Amino acid sequence: VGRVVVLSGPSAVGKSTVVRCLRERIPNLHFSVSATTRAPRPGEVDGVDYHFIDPTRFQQLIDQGELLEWAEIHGGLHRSGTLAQPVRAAAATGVPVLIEVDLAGARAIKKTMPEAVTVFLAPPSWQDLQARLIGRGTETADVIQRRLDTARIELAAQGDFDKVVVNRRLESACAELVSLLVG
Ligand SMILES: [Cl-]
């Protein structure tokens, strides 16, 4: 049975650096393809970038417990979520699965799919995260303050996850996740 790993952590901890390392290192890694009710942008492929479905069909899927998690996007402009069945099929076939979601999405998946391993990508220190939130200093004080408070709140979620990987270094954070994904 394929392992299913749900990767999350703070907004702006550096998650997507790691994700692409994962996809190069594990050749058959199934990266979950979210369902969405928005329309395709040019170059997007149904089945690959998203599963493009209509709102009504998406509501059926909600109603029938077919989404491991879902959210309203941009205040309900449209919806996106993770379909259960492709993940379960991939795992039954023996292929590893990675699902990248925010913290609310990870919590919802732990209820709908308890055998999924939730992993929190933590910064190596508060100072490392803070330096990246401040960044080039292009944002206002009020926005930065909000970012810092958000980060401290997100960081307190980390104890609920099955595992924590500390993002001390790209190559090892990636390595720890490879070992998780292929046992
Ligand atoms: Cl969790």
Side-chain angles (χ1 to χ4, degrees):
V1 175
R3 222 85 177 239
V4 180
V5 169
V6 176
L7 209 218
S8 202
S11 328
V13 95
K15 220 153 67 212
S16 167
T17 318
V18 175
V19 168
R20 73 188 250 77
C21 169
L22 289 177
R23 294 183 79 192
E24 299 170 11
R25 276 131 101 133
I26 307 177
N28 70 336
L29 172 59
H30 186 55
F31 191 46
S32 176
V33 177
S34 294
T36 186
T37 55
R38 82 159 160 78
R41 305 174 186 158
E44 286 183 324
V45 177
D46 186 49
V48 174
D49 304 272
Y50 288 94
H51 294 286
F52 298 97
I53 80 161
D54 63 79
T56 292
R57 178 55 190 183
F58 197 102
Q59 190 70 62
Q60 291 171 19
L61 296 169
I62 292 161
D63 292 335
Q64 287 147 47
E66 286 283 25
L67 275 295
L68 297 176
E69 60 80 26
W70 67 277
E72 299 287 351
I73 309 300
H74 282 148
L77 172 62
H78 70 86
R79 287 159 170 181
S80 300
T82 294
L83 286 172
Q85 205 174 286
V87 172
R88 296 190 180 280
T93 297
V95 326
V97 185
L98 179 70
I99 303 164
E100 180 178 6
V101 284
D102 64 11
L103 302 176
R107 183 173 308 279
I109 290 171
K110 196 70 184 161
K111 303 200 176 100
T112 57
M113 183 172 196
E115 71 272 32
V117 184
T118 53
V119 174
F120 186 107
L121 189 62
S125 69
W126 172 258
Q127 280 158 351
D128 183 278
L129 187 43
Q130 177 184 285
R132 284 183 279 115
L133 295 178
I134 288 166
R136 291 291 288 269
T138 53
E139 292 185 324
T140 56
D142 294 322
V143 172
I144 296 169
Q145 190 62 77
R146 185 177 175 156
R147 285 192 196 297
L148 300 179
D149 290 330
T150 298
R152 287 207 184 76
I153 285 159
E154 289 176 338
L155 289 173
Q158 77 182 261
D160 305 349
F161 277 70
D162 301 316
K163 309 276 196 309
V164 169
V165 167
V166 182
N167 200 16
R168 312 195 161 85
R169 170 107 195 223
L170 172 66
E171 299 93 318
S172 44
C174 178
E176 296 185 45
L177 284 153
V178 171
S179 291
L180 285 160
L181 275 157
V182 301

